[PDB]
Amino acid sequence: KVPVVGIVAALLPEMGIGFQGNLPWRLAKEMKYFREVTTLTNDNSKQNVVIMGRKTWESIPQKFRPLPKRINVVVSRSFDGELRKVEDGIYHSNSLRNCLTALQSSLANENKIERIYIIGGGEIYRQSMDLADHWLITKIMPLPETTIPQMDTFLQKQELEQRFYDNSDKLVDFLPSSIQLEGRLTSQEWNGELVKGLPVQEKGYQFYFTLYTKKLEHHHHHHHH
Template identity: 35%
Template sequence: MKTGSIMCEAEERVDPKPIRLVAAVSRSMGIGHKGSLPWSLPNEFKYFIDKITSVAEPGKKNLIIWGRKSFEPFAESLLPLPNCIVALLSRTLSSVPEHVYYVCRSVRDAIKKASKPPLSEEIETIWVLGGVESFAETMKHPWCDQIHITAIMEDYECDTFFPEFDRDIFKLAKEFPGIPSEIQEENGIKYAFQVYQRT
């Protein structure tokens, strides 16, 4: 598939896709400070990348929805991501950055794009990587079935926080296939992988 300057448009047929959020959060639900991560956990970060780039069906891809401010600090070192199509959220960009397939004005537009032909025939899962407004909007979408959290068991100075969500609607799974249940430790920092599943 070729990178192109295509804004999201409406079409008629809808093919619902699972929507999943993924974030690492501090004890106070912080996710960032001055535009970057307040911690350095390479193994956790690799786990996160492996998660969003994995597909169950060969030939399929995942759509990655990324807010511009969340995207820019990582773009150069991460991209291109295997098995992924990146939809960047921006109301101001007039061109498409390298390795980005679509610039969309809103989460709603990106989801619409992924759920209608021809893109829907290629997409397996939609992953949302931020920012805060994108997380808050997407967790209310009826197709959002999972929130994947790395719970970092430390406090950090943060100026950006993961939005509150209804723990009666999204319940923490005691065990989840493919997700380590034991506490991890890296660079003296403990953390746990958690999946909150829509009931």
């Protein structure tokens, strides 16, 4: 009943997302977009949930964690229940799946969660493909004179394109109202593939914010009791 959305920044064409436990880059403008999207909501009385793998949590500077104004959920095979508070703004879960079921219960959340964001972990992203309804992806490209950074973690681009389709024409509509961007929706060919979204440039990088949505399904069966 509450939308499950994955959000990530990836460097084309392989979609590298991290290197040696960190980000391969440092771009102020990209962190700005991520912070505003996950934080802002359409209903002022609601907050968004940010769910992340345990390793992504340890990569966030201690000064900025937990992420402010958002319900934080860290998942680890070594935690206790399916969803339990451990500190202020922090929930611990031993199961990403049961964690979602629990969050969906309107008895527990009393309909005060606008969205559920899956904000990180290559390992977490791989299990989200069936779980998520949508995907917010920042596609990054090094400019001509820029060196390509090294990377060791990647988004599963294949699974993404089997279940989801590029819905960027609806990116602006999909984001919370209060957010404003400094570009116009643009289509640019880069290394063969089509890159559609909102354009930005910082340091020696060119990047685009995009949106992915689940594909239609055939009607094979509905459970009758």
